Amino acid sequence: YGAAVVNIDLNRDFFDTATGIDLTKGIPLVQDLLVPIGVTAGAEQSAEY
Amino acid sequence: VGIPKLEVDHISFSNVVSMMTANIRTGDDMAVERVNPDDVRAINIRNA
């Protein structure tokens, strides 16, 4: 009695945080698979989606 | 009427044109900044 919001997403258990994936935001974010070759330092932070 | 000061063949003492200031210093100079185009590979060369 007092639940503000419920929802559905990716299970933070089958997709463990240790290997392969991470979920702090709604988007399942891994680190380095497709990094833009020739850009600035602040870029490629979206290509990890 | 009035022959020019040259081609007449005599020395004389006439007038000039001047100004007041140091003229070359204003305390400044053209101060421009240049924003870099972001990254390479996406720059357009094909304008012919």
UniProtKB/TrEMBL annotation, chain A:
Signal peptide: none annotated. It comes from Bombyx mori cytoplasmic polyhedrosis virus (BmCPV). This is VP1. The lineage of its organism: Viruses, Riboviria, Orthornavirae, Duplornaviricota, Resentoviricetes. It comes from the Viruses.
